[PDB]
Amino acid sequence: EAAACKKYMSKLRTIVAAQSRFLNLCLEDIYTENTLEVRTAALGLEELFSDADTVLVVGEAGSGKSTLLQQVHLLWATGQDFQEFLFVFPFSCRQLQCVARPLSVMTLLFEHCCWPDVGQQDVFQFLLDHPDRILLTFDGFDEFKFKFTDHERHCSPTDPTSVQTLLFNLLQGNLLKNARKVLTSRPDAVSAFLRKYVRTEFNLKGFSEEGIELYLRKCHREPGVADRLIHLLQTTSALHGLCHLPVFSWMVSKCHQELLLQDGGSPKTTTDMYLLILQHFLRHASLLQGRLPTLLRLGQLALWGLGMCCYVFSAQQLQAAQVDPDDISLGFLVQAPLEFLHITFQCFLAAFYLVLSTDVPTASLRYLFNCSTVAALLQKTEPHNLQITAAFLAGLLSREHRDLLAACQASERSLLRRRACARWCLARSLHKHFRSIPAMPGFLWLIRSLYEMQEERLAQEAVRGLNVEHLKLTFCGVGPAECAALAFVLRHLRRPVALQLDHNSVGDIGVEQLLPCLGACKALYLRDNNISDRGICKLIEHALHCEQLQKLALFNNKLTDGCAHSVAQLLACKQNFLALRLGNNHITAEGAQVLAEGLRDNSSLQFLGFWGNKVGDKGAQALAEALSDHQSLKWLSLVGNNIGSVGAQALASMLEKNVALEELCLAANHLQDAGVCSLAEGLKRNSSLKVLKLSNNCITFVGAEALLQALASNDTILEVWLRGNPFSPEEMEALSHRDSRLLL
Ligand SMILES: Nc1ncnc2c1ncn2[C@@H]1O[C@H](COP(=O)(O)OP(=O)(O)O)[C@@H](O)[C@H]1O
């Protein structure tokens, strides 16, 4: 025999592993790296854990959050990772919302997760006694409803209470203090009330471009099929775009065979994708009117549930919405209480119902864009689900799908009327948005909706009269397909806009999908967006034809010497260009030498940044020589670029000639007193440079003096930064007294 603890441990592992294992398929063969990032390197799943003991994982519908927990569970239940926890308790929030009956923690862990065969009482005790060896996971937290009578304290494990009260208290640390928790949610339902008690907060972006490649390889084993899909994607920017989000990579893979036939051109918008998967399911049975009433019966349930904030259905609810076995087999319902294959499929079918059902009055649709029980359901529906439904609604009414839908109607009269109502709401939508700004996730969904409807004139109308100068979309979850929408709408602006896209997941594919609106930008900010030389070399060939575009910022991407020649062409040819930021990439001396040629033949540039790169002495020469004669550049960072005294000589020689450079940043090289001395020689023939940052540079009092001697005859400099250098406390005292401008 063994005790009741070791017995439960082993039951739990069995049951968890048994559920975690499968998605005929095997999660362990199929799971594919899905990047995990923080604040608010970049860490893998295995690094998930490293006061307040609850970790949060947040990402858009379909970014792989459910599947991430599922792998955590599998990895634990089989020994491979996360072995510090003796017990792991998987929960699904959409299933807990369905429990009215108040609950104790016991009845939770045991009735609603895993029943111990023996020792119930003794086991629970062990858990209470050793909480630091417990993990609880809660999937899809957004699918709870937290109310005004669920905030009370409650520390009793044995005392019944409501379901949500348990969670609230679990997370604070009132129940199972020091036990770990992991939550997955959409970005909306994370308020700062919760956020107080979160260890760390991760963000789940989706597959990188080589993720997708991997994924496809893992799923398709047939000889070189993965290759031929990776070909399809590499010839089809839009489809490739969508696949950065695994639910699309899944769909693509799921329809490989019909995608590879085509014959009739690939899909482009998200609605196209959801239509393609629909017809796939319908081939296991026009084709669509064949199963029309089925889809309507499902859509009705979808909208119902959506309006009700119920994403799981009891066979009583299923009979009450008249869904027979023949309906269920079509395969949108799954997993016996049933749920929709994915939340997005609920939203698609709801949108479908909304288009075609003859119980949906035109005016009800006005609620999808914020402008019948149908109407009432829409008002009660969660915003992040309405945003999605409405995007699909837009798509289904596109001109491309006139015909599909004209099959199912006896009378297009109805469709004409809904199209026109949607179109009306959409045209108003962007004014409605900016005029009530007392936001910017709401903005993209409006963009996505205009893009899906696919009418060009409609984008134009929606944008007419707006006065946008700056458009901040940082940390907004912008991928390759958000980029496609953004382009679709923004290209129509007549005011050059500053497109601030810092900290997203644009990548090379997003850059390509942005290009049509590049003409409408005066400034493109794409820091921390995982862009390679392929992306930037493309971006430049197009930038050369946009005279409006003057600033480009590409800090912290994967650029390398391979982009050098393109950069040389940019500086040499665009001649109203103002600002270029390339900090934190992998440019080296050779790239620097190469691109500098373009600098020599440049007239207009004003800022040029290289912080974090490694141009070194030969790269610092080549830039210095280029900038000696250069008439407009006023700022230059070579911070952290491994520049010895050889490059500092060259930069000095530059200052004897250059008459325009005002600031020159050098912190974090290895300059030594040698370099500072020639730099100081330079200052004695420069009546123009204002600031000279020289922090963290192995400079000794010897150097400081050469600078001070030069500062004797030079009055134009305002500051010379030296902090962090090897100065003795007694040496520092002296330097304060000796000249005011030396910032220590
Ligand atoms: N890391 C992954 N590896 C392989 N497939 C994934 C991964 N993440 C998501 N998927 C695919 O996407 C589908 C839906 O993803 P899901 O985990 O439900 O995202 P979310 O729960 O955030 O909406 C999965 O059933 C699976 O096909």
Numbering used by the authors: 195 to 217, 225 to 241, 254 to 263, 271 to 505, 518 to 567, 577 to 612, 637 to 703, 715 to 1020
Please give me the paper's original passages concerning this structure.
NOD2, also known as NLRC2 or CARD15, belongs to the NLRC subfamily of NLRs. NOD2 possesses two tandem CARDs that function as an effector domain and is activated by muramyl dipeptide (MDP), a bacterial cell wall fragment. On activation by MDP, NOD2 is believed to undergo self-oligomerization via the central NOD domain, providing a scaffold for recruiting RIPK2 (receptor-interacting serine–threonine kinase 2) through CARD–CARD interactions. Here, we determined the crystal structure of the inactive ADP-bound form of NOD2, and revealed that ADP-bound NOD2 is maintained in an auto-inhibited/closed form through ADP-mediated and inner domain interactions of the NOD domain.
Moreover, we introduced surface entropy reduction (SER) mutations (E943A, E944A, K635A, E636A, E709A and K711A) into the OcNOD2ΔCARD construct to produce the OcNOD2ΔCARDSER construct. These CARD-defective NOD2 proteins for structural study would be inactive, because the CARD domain is required for triggering NF-κB activation through the serine–threonine kinase RIPK2. The OcNOD2Δloop construct exhibited activity comparable to the wild-type OcNOD2 in response to MDP, while the OcNOD2SER construct exhibited no activity in NF-κB reporter assays in HEK293T cells. Gel filtration chromatography analyses revealed that full-length OcNOD2, OcNOD2ΔCARD, OcNOD2ΔCARDΔloop and OcNOD2ΔCARDSER exist as monomers in solution. In addition, we determined the structure of OcNOD2ΔCARDSER, which is isomorphous to the form 1 of OcNOD2ΔCARDΔloop crystal, at 3.1 Å resolution. The structures of the NOD2 molecules in these crystals were essentially the same, with root mean squared deviations (r.m.s.d.) between 0.4 and 1.1 Å. Of note, several mutated residues for SER mapped to HD2. Mutation of these residues may alter the charge distribution, resulting in reduction of the activity of OcNOD2ΔCARDSER.
